[PDB]
XYZ file of C-alpha atoms in Angstrom:
472
model
C 101.386 98.596 76.649
C 102.694 102.057 75.950
C 101.701 104.868 73.574
C 103.151 104.399 70.091
C 105.078 107.649 70.212
C 107.170 106.397 73.116
C 107.879 103.174 71.273
C 108.906 105.170 68.210
C 111.453 107.137 70.229
C 113.081 103.828 71.059
C 112.792 102.413 67.542
C 114.519 105.434 66.034
C 117.225 105.400 68.684
C 117.869 101.705 68.330
C 117.767 101.782 64.521
C 120.424 104.501 64.381
C 122.649 103.672 67.305
C 122.595 99.861 67.409
C 121.274 98.611 64.105
C 122.557 100.778 61.246
C 125.680 102.144 62.909
C 126.502 99.551 65.562
C 128.401 96.310 64.997
C 127.054 95.914 61.449
C 128.815 99.192 60.580
C 131.845 98.398 62.683
C 132.601 95.168 60.837
C 131.650 96.593 57.453
C 134.307 99.229 58.045
C 136.880 96.484 58.130
C 135.433 94.392 55.308
C 135.501 97.269 52.738
C 138.622 98.747 54.199
C 137.544 102.110 55.569
C 139.333 100.955 58.717
C 141.536 98.181 59.928
C 140.566 95.950 62.815
C 143.657 95.954 65.061
C 142.498 94.411 68.343
C 140.424 91.584 69.741
C 137.308 90.577 67.836
C 137.756 93.123 65.046
C 141.376 91.925 64.687
C 140.094 88.386 64.037
C 137.584 89.789 61.557
C 140.383 91.662 59.823
C 142.583 88.577 59.380
C 139.511 86.515 58.675
C 140.074 83.990 61.423
C 136.722 82.465 62.492
C 135.160 85.756 63.433
C 133.449 86.568 60.142
C 131.639 83.241 59.917
C 130.669 82.602 63.548
C 126.970 82.748 64.457
C 128.038 84.548 67.676
C 129.535 87.468 65.964
C 126.401 89.353 64.963
C 124.027 87.758 67.422
C 123.479 90.998 69.299
C 122.986 93.012 66.121
C 120.663 90.334 64.807
C 118.562 90.278 67.965
C 118.520 94.073 68.017
C 117.285 94.464 64.464
C 114.467 91.949 65.047
C 113.624 93.701 68.311
C 113.325 97.095 66.579
C 111.231 95.481 63.828
C 108.893 93.933 66.348
C 108.479 97.258 68.109
C 107.755 99.069 64.813
C 105.129 96.470 64.074
C 103.560 96.980 67.489
C 103.240 100.675 66.650
C 101.705 99.835 63.295
C 99.132 97.659 64.980
C 98.463 100.083 67.819
C 97.914 102.841 65.246
C 95.421 100.809 63.290
C 91.666 100.560 63.661
C 90.971 98.895 66.963
C 94.378 100.002 68.155
C 94.867 102.048 71.312
C 96.549 104.657 69.150
C 93.998 104.719 66.358
C 94.157 107.994 64.440
C 97.908 108.381 64.693
C 98.534 107.809 61.003
C 101.613 109.982 60.756
C 103.280 108.138 63.650
C 102.182 104.983 61.904
C 103.927 106.027 58.737
C 107.122 106.838 60.562
C 107.004 103.350 62.102
C 106.396 101.850 58.647
C 109.547 103.540 57.418
C 111.514 102.146 60.375
C 110.021 98.713 59.730
C 111.195 98.903 56.126
C 114.611 100.045 57.217
C 115.098 97.179 59.619
C 113.764 94.602 57.201
C 116.344 95.826 54.739
C 119.182 95.415 57.251
C 117.991 91.888 57.750
C 117.719 91.143 54.075
C 120.937 92.904 53.080
C 123.156 91.372 55.710
C 121.750 87.963 56.292
C 119.967 87.119 53.053
C 117.031 84.790 53.327
C 115.696 85.026 56.853
C 112.589 85.063 59.048
C 110.473 88.156 58.584
C 106.817 87.744 57.674
C 106.447 85.285 60.549
C 108.880 86.865 62.978
C 107.225 89.383 65.363
C 105.797 79.011 66.093
C 109.286 78.804 64.733
C 109.055 81.359 61.906
C 109.812 80.293 58.408
C 112.592 81.835 56.502
C 111.409 84.281 53.838
C 113.443 84.649 50.680
C 115.362 87.871 50.389
C 113.089 88.706 47.489
C 110.036 88.216 49.715
C 111.583 90.489 52.326
C 112.154 93.192 49.694
C 108.534 92.970 48.599
C 107.640 93.647 52.257
C 110.103 96.484 52.389
C 108.611 98.319 49.413
C 105.136 97.643 50.722
C 106.003 99.251 54.030
C 107.353 102.300 52.201
C 104.240 102.594 50.067
C 102.102 102.357 53.199
C 104.294 104.974 54.785
C 104.036 107.329 51.805
C 100.278 107.276 52.178
C 100.067 107.483 55.945
C 102.641 110.252 56.277
C 100.285 112.499 54.359
C 97.550 112.164 56.935
C 97.423 113.127 60.605
C 98.172 112.333 64.203
C 95.998 112.729 67.264
C 98.888 112.705 69.721
C 101.884 114.963 69.016
C 104.930 112.843 68.225
C 107.288 115.783 67.935
C 109.443 115.212 71.017
C 109.709 111.470 70.334
C 110.671 111.859 66.665
C 114.431 112.098 67.093
C 114.857 112.078 63.338
C 112.634 114.913 62.149
C 110.805 116.438 65.138
C 107.432 115.539 63.684
C 107.965 116.912 60.179
C 106.007 114.414 58.000
C 107.176 116.000 54.740
C 110.780 115.219 55.651
C 109.797 111.662 56.495
C 108.104 111.484 53.115
C 111.375 112.601 51.483
C 113.218 109.972 53.524
C 110.741 107.278 52.354
C 111.396 108.203 48.685
C 115.104 108.266 49.365
C 114.816 104.712 50.625
C 112.831 103.714 47.558
C 115.761 104.974 45.520
C 118.311 103.095 47.635
C 116.332 99.877 47.460
C 115.466 100.145 43.781
C 119.146 100.421 42.903
C 119.893 97.621 45.383
C 117.957 95.065 43.337
C 119.059 96.191 39.892
C 120.945 93.002 39.098
C 117.623 91.229 39.273
C 115.682 93.705 37.156
C 113.628 92.883 34.073
C 113.880 96.491 32.978
C 116.894 98.341 34.218
C 116.223 101.535 32.323
C 112.761 101.798 33.920
C 114.450 101.154 37.285
C 117.060 103.871 36.740
C 114.263 106.281 35.828
C 112.429 105.320 38.993
C 115.526 106.077 41.033
C 115.682 109.539 39.427
C 112.009 110.140 40.140
C 112.314 109.009 43.764
C 115.379 111.224 44.188
C 113.389 114.154 42.885
C 110.892 113.566 45.651
C 113.542 113.176 48.319
C 116.188 115.265 50.092
C 116.815 118.704 48.590
C 119.904 119.285 50.745
C 121.842 117.901 53.688
C 119.331 119.693 55.849
C 116.728 117.238 54.736
C 118.844 114.168 55.283
C 117.882 111.456 57.757
C 120.171 112.200 60.645
C 119.935 111.044 64.210
C 121.593 114.075 65.660
C 120.931 113.989 69.394
C 124.415 113.069 70.577
C 126.107 114.924 73.429
C 128.866 114.901 76.041
C 126.939 112.144 77.692
C 125.148 110.455 74.831
C 127.703 109.331 72.282
C 128.058 108.510 68.609
C 128.281 104.720 68.104
C 131.342 104.669 65.848
C 133.095 106.909 68.376
C 131.666 104.557 70.991
C 133.291 101.477 69.575
C 136.709 103.126 69.501
C 136.166 104.604 72.932
C 135.369 101.148 74.298
C 137.686 98.951 72.231
C 140.336 101.143 70.615
C 139.978 98.584 67.837
C 140.527 100.477 64.609
C 143.675 101.510 62.788
C 144.051 103.830 59.795
C 143.477 102.006 56.486
C 146.469 101.797 54.176
C 144.396 100.930 51.096
C 142.142 103.894 51.805
C 145.170 106.175 52.197
C 146.520 104.958 48.871
C 143.285 106.060 47.144
C 143.119 109.402 48.903
C 146.762 110.086 48.033
C 146.294 109.071 44.440
C 143.528 111.650 44.099
C 145.091 114.176 46.361
C 141.684 114.096 48.007
C 141.421 116.927 50.607
C 140.912 114.316 53.352
C 144.352 112.831 52.617
C 145.965 115.647 54.547
C 143.325 116.149 57.118
C 141.508 113.009 58.282
C 144.383 111.100 59.933
C 145.982 111.175 63.347
C 149.133 109.491 64.546
C 149.393 107.186 67.516
C 149.885 108.944 70.836
C 153.480 110.033 71.313
C 154.528 111.996 74.343
C 150.913 112.634 75.266
C 149.990 113.971 71.834
C 148.618 112.672 68.608
C 149.438 114.670 65.523
C 147.298 115.373 62.479
C 149.345 114.141 59.501
C 149.165 113.319 55.785
C 148.262 109.795 54.766
C 151.845 109.331 53.476
C 153.609 110.581 56.559
C 155.355 107.573 58.084
C 154.528 108.871 61.562
C 150.907 107.956 60.916
C 151.821 104.309 61.197
C 148.841 103.124 59.133
C 147.638 99.576 59.542
C 148.144 97.080 56.713
C 144.813 95.785 55.508
C 144.365 92.168 56.413
C 147.695 91.802 58.243
C 148.225 94.146 61.192
C 149.983 93.249 64.376
C 147.376 93.047 67.133
C 147.603 96.199 69.230
C 145.491 99.106 70.425
C 148.463 101.441 70.536
C 150.713 100.803 67.525
C 148.734 102.230 64.625
C 147.467 105.621 63.711
C 143.816 106.298 63.171
C 141.171 108.073 61.158
C 140.030 111.391 62.714
C 136.546 109.882 62.660
C 137.055 107.653 65.704
C 136.987 110.851 67.874
C 133.817 112.363 66.303
C 131.946 112.127 69.588
C 128.827 114.000 68.582
C 128.730 113.450 64.841
C 125.242 112.433 63.717
C 124.311 108.986 62.627
C 123.155 109.253 59.028
C 120.341 106.718 58.341
C 120.555 108.117 54.847
C 122.638 111.012 53.648
C 122.054 113.658 51.090
C 125.380 112.698 49.524
C 124.281 109.082 49.221
C 121.137 110.251 47.455
C 123.174 112.324 45.009
C 125.439 109.348 44.355
C 122.343 107.326 43.576
C 121.213 110.027 41.196
C 124.655 110.105 39.561
C 124.829 106.307 39.348
C 121.390 106.196 37.725
C 122.406 108.768 35.101
C 125.660 106.974 34.374
C 123.928 103.682 33.873
C 121.379 105.499 31.633
C 124.240 106.764 29.556
C 123.365 110.333 30.550
C 125.444 113.205 31.909
C 125.956 112.839 35.674
C 128.478 115.591 36.151
C 126.355 118.050 38.125
C 124.943 115.278 40.214
C 128.354 113.856 40.989
C 129.674 117.256 41.957
C 126.808 117.787 44.337
C 127.510 114.379 45.861
C 131.288 114.859 46.204
C 130.929 118.332 47.715
C 128.241 117.176 50.198
C 130.407 114.173 51.137
C 133.387 116.405 51.777
C 131.335 118.841 53.896
C 130.025 115.944 56.005
C 133.588 114.695 56.405
C 134.706 118.108 57.512
C 131.823 118.250 59.969
C 133.034 115.087 61.635
C 136.704 115.920 61.404
C 136.109 119.282 63.160
C 134.006 117.641 65.875
C 136.911 115.224 66.410
C 139.551 117.953 66.603
C 137.445 119.842 69.113
C 136.926 116.679 71.176
C 140.668 115.829 71.297
C 141.571 119.326 72.338
C 145.055 119.490 73.830
C 145.432 115.812 73.061
C 146.153 116.759 69.483
C 148.634 118.756 67.458
C 146.859 119.847 64.285
C 148.644 120.345 60.996
C 148.209 123.410 58.735
C 145.499 121.882 56.616
C 142.640 124.177 55.705
C 139.052 123.563 56.664
C 137.136 121.920 53.793
C 134.530 124.365 52.479
C 131.874 124.423 49.773
C 134.337 126.443 47.663
C 137.428 124.371 48.272
C 135.495 121.162 47.723
C 133.985 122.428 44.464
C 137.415 123.423 43.194
C 138.774 120.029 44.086
C 135.981 118.483 42.081
C 136.797 120.748 39.091
C 140.526 120.254 39.404
C 140.597 116.504 39.875
C 137.326 114.590 39.764
C 135.789 116.141 36.676
C 138.412 114.761 34.283
C 138.305 111.287 35.883
C 134.537 111.301 35.621
C 134.744 112.262 31.901
C 137.071 109.309 31.356
C 135.078 106.651 33.245
C 131.744 108.029 34.463
C 130.334 105.092 36.373
C 133.642 103.877 37.749
C 134.537 107.324 39.034
C 131.078 107.858 40.452
C 131.240 104.725 42.558
C 134.836 105.414 43.710
C 133.608 108.807 44.858
C 130.588 107.287 46.604
C 133.017 104.967 48.380
C 135.286 107.855 49.497
C 132.345 110.037 50.642
C 130.833 107.286 52.770
C 133.940 106.893 54.922
C 133.406 108.530 58.291
C 131.705 108.450 61.702
C 128.275 108.639 60.051
C 127.438 104.914 60.016
C 127.766 104.638 56.191
C 130.093 101.619 55.963
C 127.023 99.518 56.309
C 125.643 100.863 53.037
C 129.083 100.956 51.319
C 129.328 97.267 51.964
C 125.975 96.739 50.207
C 127.213 98.761 47.230
C 130.424 96.734 47.125
C 128.663 93.461 47.077
C 126.119 94.736 44.554
C 129.044 95.679 42.265
C 130.375 92.176 42.770
C 127.085 90.689 41.607
C 127.246 93.000 38.561
C 130.832 91.849 37.994
C 132.207 95.317 38.475
C 135.608 95.883 40.062
C 135.748 99.629 40.754
C 136.692 99.608 44.424
C 140.042 97.991 45.134
C 140.511 96.016 48.349
C 143.963 94.829 49.388
C 143.288 92.322 52.200
C 145.136 89.157 51.064
C 142.644 87.006 52.868
C 139.990 88.007 50.390
C 141.228 85.322 47.972
C 138.954 82.875 49.744
C 137.611 84.787 52.757
C 135.803 87.882 51.607
C 132.491 87.807 53.444
C 129.554 87.966 51.063
C 127.197 88.264 54.001
C 126.939 88.143 57.805
C 126.292 84.873 59.608
C 122.906 84.203 61.216
C 122.577 84.836 64.944
C 123.112 81.865 67.201
C 119.977 82.808 69.046
C 118.133 81.567 65.987
C 120.484 78.775 64.924
C 119.558 77.439 68.363
C 115.835 78.139 68.357
C 115.107 77.726 64.631
C 115.961 74.469 62.814
C 115.539 76.219 59.484
C 117.996 78.921 60.376
C 120.288 76.307 61.895
C 120.222 74.377 58.648
C 120.944 77.529 56.603
C 123.856 78.576 58.842
C 125.539 75.190 58.554
C 129.147 75.608 59.785
C 129.183 79.182 58.588
C 131.551 78.657 55.636
C 128.652 79.686 53.386
C 129.269 83.328 54.297
C 132.200 83.179 51.911
C 130.626 81.182 49.082
C 126.909 82.052 48.941
C 126.116 85.546 47.724
C 122.798 87.126 48.765
C 119.993 87.067 46.170
C 120.307 90.626 44.901
C 123.968 89.807 44.302
C 123.138 86.831 42.119
C 122.833 84.317 44.960
C 120.033 81.833 45.618
C 119.652 81.929 49.411
């Protein structure tokens, strides 16, 4: 038994570092081609050999998400009447938001799964049932966050330093994310799009409001950076480079580093052969052959539980689907995405120091980004509003921020909507594009229901999740 605030510190840390931007994000990066898995486990994921369908693969992530959920629930109980932490309603609300967040990771990645009974052998809840719980948590949160605390949670709130109004914005931001998530299943899409717009209006007003776990240092590292630091397992994505080059996106000439040659990597354009980008779905296995995204060296970049740019892309997507003008919204989203990219790129350059030869590329600014939007994106948006909007969301959400996780949700949601806006080139996707993550072996062992649902794991390639038009 410990005070809820101390538990919350852990829940926030674990949700950012291990849950949202850990292995779930690592593998997503490969699946939607932000990166190429070039060594060991991620190599096998890349070429789709066993790895994507094995119950072992996400066992740790699985256990971690359930652990964080349990802890959040302990806070919620402790903060209730009769609880040791009674009167800490604001802390309670924060915990309710983290509970929602973790339930969503469960539902989004694994589909139907234990929830209501997790935290005998818990039954599996339908993904729809989990989403009902998710929204319910957020509604609870919205109410509680407007109350008070007895004990000051400030130093334990690694997200917002005790600012309940920012949490409230975050809760609405999540309502937007989750409303759009389930759109395929809606009985009234227009009402849903209008809800998204309303929720956005009550959410982040700028990047300063965004839900960022920004406590990384020399000694406490970013998890994306961490993976590369530990495994050197990513290579620069060819498919991604093709897109960037086609658009002449500012990041094309700025977000890529060559392999190490004579003790130096060099910052090069996506089409410079010295980059040695990795072919999606077919690299040679090696931790030294292929070039990389700048993002793998973004040691202290924050983990974005939900970005301002993502929120603006939601706003833009909602307007597009409503047949309304999304231009201003899209610009705001593209510029914010570029500025976040530049933040991480700069962190990475600083971290590499003398290990890197920079090119002559200019720092991406609010001005340069805006001009790029005007010069390139605006016309493409005019031509195909929705399509362009989602391509841009996709390009913005590439980084060290932990956003692959969410990009992978968007990709699969588009699939369920029979939309083909984001091109993937992995040849193994003909029959081995993972529609979901396999259940953790901890539960295939302990839970006959989960064991039955996991089968031999082939289902990960044939059974979409419910919000994607699936049944389980």
